[model samples]
Target chain A: RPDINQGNYLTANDVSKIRVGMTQQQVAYALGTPLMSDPFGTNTWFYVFRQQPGHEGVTQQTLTLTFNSSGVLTNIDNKPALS
Target chain B: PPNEIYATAQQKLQDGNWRQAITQLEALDNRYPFGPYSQQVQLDLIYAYYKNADLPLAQAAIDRFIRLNPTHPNIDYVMYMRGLTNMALDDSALQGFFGVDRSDRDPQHARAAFSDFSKLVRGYPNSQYTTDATKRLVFLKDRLAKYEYSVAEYYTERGAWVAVVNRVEGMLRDYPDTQATRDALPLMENAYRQMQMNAQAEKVAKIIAANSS
Candidate 1:
């Protein structure tokens, strides 16, 4: 059974380490490329991590991070891996 | 029928293919010189030309539209597009002022941009683009004020009190909303004091105090 390792692997603790006012470039350097950049609205960064392909008893997770004008992290949301 | 052509043109415009949309509208206008949906095609073509950044074509389309359908219900749209064309040109002119080459700066262009935006706001107060035009007008005003402030600051730094006073007064006259006025007022007063213009300095100080209040 080959496990799916798609998306990204970032923890709440990892996100907690991030502070507000980090430039988009600096955040990219820290967290790698986001899964997708927000095309509209405020600058938002997102990362995803999927454990299995199409629910074969696999776990999935996602994290969305938002930043303010001065490049400070403003909000973070994470969906924990559901067994 | 003209309806089918209009539908196709609408689809093309929605698909971000303004050039194709314009072609369809032009073909409809040519094939049925007095088509029932001729006005619709002309109006859509105006928008398509605008979207394609063909300002001349857009202006021509609007002119044709107005000449052909002066009593058209969407006459406001024609006027709006005319304003938009002027605004687009004004925007390009203002862009030249962004770089280090101060010689490229044109206060007149900024003023023109403000006027175009104002025309849009006044001519079609309820138009969807009115809000954006008004906001851009405010931004242009701020930028123009900042440019004046920059020159005033340069004069102030050189101890050229007379030049500073003139620049500051010009800003107060032409761009009172500029943040530079807050800093400029005090500096102007100090400059006047240095120049032994005690009475003028006191008057300016009183004005600044009233403004702060």
Candidate 2:
């Protein structure tokens, strides 16, 4: 494959860095940039790292971040996932 | 005749073909807008719209129903039906979109649903629908309270002292009895201190310490 993407970009250690009471900036600093924005002010953030070598019917992960009304981080809702 | 179209629409509804039933019912309502079957078809239309996952359409169907039949006997069910559409409005985004089970997301839909359930319960405490409405009301109230706590937690963590103060106060006001207050009262103290409400903050701190000690 030409663009063979890498492993699970969000490692265990990276997951550890996300904690309750952290700011969104702090979480982004701990891990990598999320693939989503809170443009709707839904206060929920979405992140997924694309899997490689499969055109379709394949693997994906989701890392979710939740913030409060004041734009402060409240939860790191991790799934068996990413984007 | 009960309108041959009405019979057919009823058959379609029985078979769970919501789309076809909706089409037939719409036509029935249009043709017999002033007939005996007008109200019945509109009610059926609400069911069909909801089954087809057209929430706004279902809502509109019910709204049209109550506005026209202000003294209808089934007002309890009408309001309950409205809440039905909102029950899982946030489920998809809360689960699939975020891949999280917790509802650390939108509270608007839940709040709307809670209001609907409350209206139903208060107006017709013994209505057949009130039992389920009562249960869901508790769930939504708790979840809504939890959502407030999450938001306050965010503010407290981010050093939005004033924001945390105001938000926690609102949460306590709305859900004074929820265990949400357990997290809230302590955080309230922290938030107050951050806002330089030092005397009050220290008093809250002492209260919490007394309870713990």
Candidate 3:
């Protein structure tokens, strides 16, 4: 399976699984562990996922998800999810 | 007869016996409706009511003084007393709010107290009480801001993003000078992002960045 090394893999389908009203804890559980969590002006939770290092030749994929304080899915930047 | 009563009232008032003074002054006023001392007695009655802690009566007396002597050289004193009466009323109302149990959550009384203080400010703009009134206005503004923050916290705890947004927006709009707005902006941005309002969230982020820079 193509996935980032030590990075949480979340395709567009994974993002779709998340909804507008999910809690911060629920989002963490749904997306697995996030690669980076930033808390500066506003506390933001970021999840970054990409194809496996060696499997870049097989599948070019990347996913980035950002969530707000209430654990609502703020943004999803990634390729389509596989069925 | 009026002179005797006026003299006795002056002595009692000067001796700090406000009740006795008021009694004699009332007698003087009734005995000689147009006596030379009648105006002075009326003016002193205003002070007597204030000294007796009858704030409503004192305020009424001051109102009458202002109405009767619109161009009085000491009109500022009457205005000051009016402001003091309103301030006292506001303080009592605020104390009443704290008297209730926390779960009662009576914001209505708090709002009324703020209104009373505001009236003091507006009604006596040039009075000596203006400084105190301004300070109280600032205090009330911060109190209102904190109340909004509390409501925002409630919505946040319940995971109600929309409700949080509305509460935070109100805080920002009404109490922008308050420190609470700093906390509220981030919370609002977070909620906006969660609701998938990326544009709005980004706009908030830009504002935060500008503020920090």
Candidate 4:
């Protein structure tokens, strides 16, 4: 099966480097731009990954982030699958 | 202190020490968020980020600067840098490996870079960077067209006639002058035949005959 991968594909190691209270810019520097982010405002960011194999099924991974009014990461949800 | 930091960053920039320059530049930007040297600081920061292999940061800084200073005199330079950054983002060492093909992979960064160069060329036709931007634009279009062709080929092999036809049509429309367009005509005709649409197949066949050169 031909493998297809999309988005940031964050790993446990990448997640370990992120922490609460980090600035948005610092978070972006650590991990590339989120696959999805709020366009109306910059409060939420989603690092989503979708993998499609030709014969089998679809697998997904996601990391959701919420920023406070001060542009600091206030919450990180869904660390996603390990490895 | 801000001036001293900028001065040090400038020295690092001149000496090609992008790693050192990035730290001082970021520090300067934080210290003096907006100052006499603000614009120049951002411009240098974009360059330093790209040279330091921080492509995403370079693109972010470019977009931030472009949005803030849409009519800045150096906007063309920033646009060019944005295109360069995206092109760098698309590159990988894996392409150098034997028997490896990446043209079928997602061309997201390539598409972004092509858009970047297209905007630069169209918006600043007389700018010093436009010539190079246009050159890269043509190269990117060809690459993108080939990518489409690869996808179309995959769909053809999978017996997805509709997918193959639509991809071929998009390649023809999006990259009319590319070699992929010429190469895709037969694929389209074959897909049409597979779908039992002899009329459309005949149309494609006639065009292929007329432009077999």
- Give me the candidate number with maximum TM-score: 4
Per-residue lDDT of candidate 3, residues B1-213 (tens digit): 566667777887888577888777767767777777656788888778777777877767777777777776666566656655655554554546567523224455446546656775676577666787678668766766766777787767656454566677667767778866887788888876754335467878988998872
DockQ leader: 3
Q: Estimate each model's TM-score.
A: 0.52, 0.65, 0.52, 0.68
TM-score of chain B of each: 0.67, 0.87, 0.65, 0.92
| Candidate 4 docking classification | incorrect
What are the per-residue Cα lDDT tens digits for candidate 4 across B1-213?
776777778988998567888988888898889889899999888888888887778878988997899887778888888888888778755676675766777789998898878877777888888778878888888888888888888877866454566677667767889888898789988976753333466777888999966
Off by over 4 Å in 4: A1-83, B97-99
List where candidate 3 sits over 4 angstroms from the true fold: A1-83, B25-40, B66-70, B93-130, B155-164, B209-213
Q: What fraction of the true Cα-Cα contacts (under 8 Å, chains A to B) does candidate 3 also have?
A: 0.00
Report the C-alpha lDDT of model 4 over A12-38, residue by residue, as the tens digit: 788778878898888888888765443
Q: In candidate 2 chain B, what residue range of length 10 has the lowest lDDT sum? A: B191-200
Best by lDDT: 4
If the candidates were sorted by their TM-score against the true structure, best first, what order would they fall in?
Answer: 4, 2, 1, 3
Q: In candidate 3, what are the lDDT values of residues A22-77, reduced to their tens digit?
A: 67677777777654443335555544332335434323233445566555756654
DockQ of 3: 0.02
lDDT of 2 by residue, B84-129 (tens): 8888664535366756757587678897888888878888877789
- Candidate 4: residue pairs that collide: none
